[PDB]
DNA sequence: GGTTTTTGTCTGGCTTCACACTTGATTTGCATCACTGTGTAAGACAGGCCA
């Protein structure tokens, strides 16, 4: 794992912590830009590349029967397989929280023009949330998504002007969520008895793994890693958990998928106070430490860190900027 | 209804200021001076995407 440090060009700005890469056929995009999108980029959706470590964001366009989505910070997201990604929830430039979904593919290209349509939602529709994990389970030739955890405003009842910001917790119901049809079911599950956000998700075949995270209401970042399986038969689906001993403590943590079946985690907050320096590596469930990579002193006493999977087996990460630019931003890879 | 208060009424002879008038040398009131540094926005100017 060798840390690389990236330079920028004159759109360094649209970068704010929240934002998201998407991966599709090999090329890199970028969305979640800082403030609304501008003449110079409608859709704010932008090709992602990064040549001779210098970072360049192309305008990318979107396709006449698009819908032209909010930049989003925080919001659940997850590849699904046309190769497409699904995007739920997050927060405006507005900071609104979005409750739609929408759904990125690639439609035509030319020397990428993106479709973007969303999806409408009834049922159990999850309240508006950031700071959640959607993941695709499959089970006997179904496919279905899975929604868990995140943060919210308050309810309309108790919120009020002197804590309009203030968040909490959302239940920790599990969703499944058809993106056919747009249908949603809500499960209670036992084992899950507090709220979390900032986790880390794996999804293999009929089961998702929930690692870290943090709990706002005991302000814990607990040690617990969960096992979700789903089955899918020709009724209604039947969910089950289990608690799992050997669950890392971690929150903000980033992810990504080295070789085949094999997945790496680079660190996030440990503490309010401490960052998590160390890597770890998940074969698919055990996880093992890995050897901490070359961090540069300004990584190190940084308070604040923030990053994405590139898809790539490789991490972009950014650091804000000296008292006296505004980030400094390095490539760290695996494998 | 009785039983309690507020607020007047009628005089004058009192006490305590304000005004009266002047002159001209002080004292106050008031608007102005000359002057730059700083914020602001009117307007040069650098710039990179796509044809």
Known sequence: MSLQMVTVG????????????????????????????????PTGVFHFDIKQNHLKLKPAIFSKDSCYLPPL?????????????????????????????????VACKNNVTFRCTEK???????????????????????????????????????????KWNSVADCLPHVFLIDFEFGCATSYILPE????????????????????????????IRPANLYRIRVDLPLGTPAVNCTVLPGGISVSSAILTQTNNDEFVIVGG???????????????????????????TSDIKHSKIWFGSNMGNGTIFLGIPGDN????????????
């Open 73 to 105: 910070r925080y919001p659940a997201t997850c590849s699904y397989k046309k190769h497409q990604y699904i995007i739920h929830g997050g927060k405006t430039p507005n900071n609104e929280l979005s409750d739609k979904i929408y759904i990125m593919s």
């Open 269 to 295: 907050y440990q503490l309010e106070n401490q960052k998590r320096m160390v890597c770890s590596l998940v074969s698919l469930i055990e996880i093992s430490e890995m050897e901490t990579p070359d961090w």
């Open 10 to 41: 004159h759109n360094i700005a649209l970068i704010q912590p929240g934002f998201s890469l998407m991966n599709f056929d090999g090329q890199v995009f970028f969305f979640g830009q800082k403030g609304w999108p501008k003449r110079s980029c």
């Open 192 to 219: 899950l008895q507090d709220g979390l956000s900032f986790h880390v998700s794996i999804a293999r075949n009929d089961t998702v793994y929930i690692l870290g995270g943090h709990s706002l209401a005991s302000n």
């Open 324 to 335: 006296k630019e505004a980030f400094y931003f390095y490539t760290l890879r695996c494998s």
């Open 120 to 162: 409408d939602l009834v049922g159990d529709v999850p309240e508006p949330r950031y700071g959640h994990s959607i993941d695709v389970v499959y089970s006997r030739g179904k496919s279905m998504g899975v929604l868990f955890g995140g943060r919210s405003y308050m309810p309309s009842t108790q919120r009020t002007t002197e």
